[PDB]
Amino acid sequence: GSSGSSGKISNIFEDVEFCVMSGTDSQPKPDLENRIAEFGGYIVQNPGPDTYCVIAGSENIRVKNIILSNKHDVVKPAWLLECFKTKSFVPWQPRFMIHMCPSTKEHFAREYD
Numbered sequence: 853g854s855s856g857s858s859g860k861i862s863n864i865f866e867d868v869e870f871c872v873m874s875g876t877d878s879q880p881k882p883d884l885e886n887r888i889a890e891f892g893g894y895i896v897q898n899p900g901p902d903t904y905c906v907i908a909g910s911e912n913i914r915v916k917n918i919i920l921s922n923k924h925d926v927v928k929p930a931w932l933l934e935c936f937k938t939k940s941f942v943p944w945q946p947r948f949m950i951h952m953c954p955s956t957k958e959h960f961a962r963e964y965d
Contacts, residue, residue: 864941865893873908873915875929884932891935899924907932908950919951926951 870888872895875881884907885895899906899918908915909929918924931948935941946960 860892861890862939863892864935864939865891869894869896869903871896871899871903871906872929873906873918874910874912876909879929879933884929887936888932922953925949925953925956
């Protein structure tokens, strides 16, 4: 709907969709969902053509389906924290990303070397 003077912490995730499948002990699944939004981010249920990426700390039923399709990329729920603690858009890392399309993974392969 509409709004007035929103009280968002930052806009780092401005116009950025987010889909959380599962979280961790310290932080529950619906943990980042709330935060992200506060940082000017969008939270959906199912990943689509207008989705940045997925956030999954482990492998689950739903998460799997997304993996099989090999269309989107999976990321750990921790990477999100680094942004909440530094209030900035932290650069993707090989330790945070769990699954990356064959078009993106290739790029990382080089970096490793």
